[PDB]
Design a protein around this ligand. Structure first.
Ligand code: HTM
Length: 359
């Protein structure tokens, strides 16, 4: 597999199990915040890491529970971090669900009991505020038309528009017809730095967990998990409110079962931005994590062949652009589930290492 600057297990099954990673880079701090669900999904945990370029390594501090990221009598899941570069505030969106509830029970029961929450930190994640239940104000009446919903999982997005809008990728299971609820991706939008929220319009049916990135004029690309053999990709020219164009990207395979979550980010093109995406590449199972490059975003056909990042069992992942790397090329940080969900691995590499022919 691809030569990397670092490969370290940051979460391991012990007294608890860990899944659903989220990664967030704090530019001015040369540090990363790695989030995950601590399952018996009861709570969300976090580990802070300081990146030292001279040693090509990130030093990870002790794991800590995000105590405030929970509602009484509920399980917390789907950590979705975001850093507001204008207010200096760190956001951690997440979903809370009643304890007396499971997952399969959520998908179809026609009774939505899922809550949308957020906690903020003004000291780089050291301490957090009390949770804010955004459910009613951010969703509205539509709430009753869904069996359930979720955000991310994974890092969110802040646009370079006038308002420096906050965009939270998400999806809802909607009771459309004698069938089972059908999932459609969408984005929660805020133009006042998380003060108030609005629900964006749905993308094509049969799209789940997704992530968004901003490209160059201004377009928001959405990459979503689907129930088909390929990923679904959509574009928005109005900051996420509407995702007009939408299509299957055959080049980006989805494992047989129900597919698998993937990650996507934009980063400064070496030559304004290029995209990077990570997801299992095995056509019959969740294995062999691959990195894909799109140097002519968002063109679906411009997606490249995947480069092998890690062999073996691999699932969910999250990416973060970490600025300039040791070799002068774009540096990347990646967090992914591995070995039948026995751990979550941190991987750090550069564009030169992954796509030598494009740098
Ligand atoms: C909120 C929640 O239960 N998330 C699930 C997510 O659900 C997908 C929709 C299925 O119909 O899938 C998986 C998964 O490993 O495949 C892990 C997450 O923890």
């Amino acid at each position: 597999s691809l030569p990397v600057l670092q490969k370290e297990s940051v979460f391991q099954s012990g007294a608890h199990a860990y899944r659903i990673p989220a990664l967030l880079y704090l530019p001015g701090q040369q540090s990363l915040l790695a989030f995950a669900e601590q399952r018996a999904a009861e709570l969300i945990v976090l580990r802070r890491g300081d990146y030292d370029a001279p040693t090509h390594q990130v030093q990870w501090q002790a794991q800590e529970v995000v105590a405030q990221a929970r509602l009484d009598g509920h399980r917390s899941m789907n950590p979705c971090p975001l850093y507001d570069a204008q207010t200096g505030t760190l956001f951690l969106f997440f979903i809370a669900i009643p304890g007396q509830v499971t997952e399969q029970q959520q998908l179809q029961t026609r009774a939505n009991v899922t809550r949308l929450c957020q906690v903020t930190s003004t000291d780089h994640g050291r301490t957090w505020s009390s949770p804010r239940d955004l459910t009613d104000a951010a969703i509205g009446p539509a709430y009753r038309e869904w069996s359930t919903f979720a955000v991310g999982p994974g890092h969110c997005l802040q646009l370079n528009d006038r308002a420096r809008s906050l965009v939270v990728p998400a999806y809802a299971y909607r009771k459309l017809h004698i069938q089972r609820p059908i999932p459609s991706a969408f984005c929660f939008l805020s133009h006042d730095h998380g003060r108030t929220w609005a629900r964006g319009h749905f993308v094509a049916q049969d799209t789940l967990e997704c992530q968004v990135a901003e490209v160059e004029q201004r377009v928001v690309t959405l990459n979503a998990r689907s129930h088909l053999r390929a990923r679904v990709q959509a574009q928005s020219t109005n900051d996420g409110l509407d995702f007009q164009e939408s299509q299957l990207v055959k080049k980006l395979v989805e494992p047989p079962p129900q597919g698998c979550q993937g990650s996507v980010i934009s980063f400064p093109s070496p030559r304004a931005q290029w995209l990077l995406y990570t997801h299992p590449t095995h056509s019959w199972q969740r294995a062999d994590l691959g990195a894909y490059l799109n140097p002519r975003p968002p063109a679906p056909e411009a997606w490249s062949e995947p480069v092998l990042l890690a062999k073996g069992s691999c699932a969910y992942s999250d990416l973060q652009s970490m600025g300039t790397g040791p070799d002068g090329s774009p540096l990347f940080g990646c967090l992914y589930e591995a070995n039948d969900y026995e751990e979550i691995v941190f991987l750090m590499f550069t564009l030169k290492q992954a796509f030598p022919a494009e740098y």
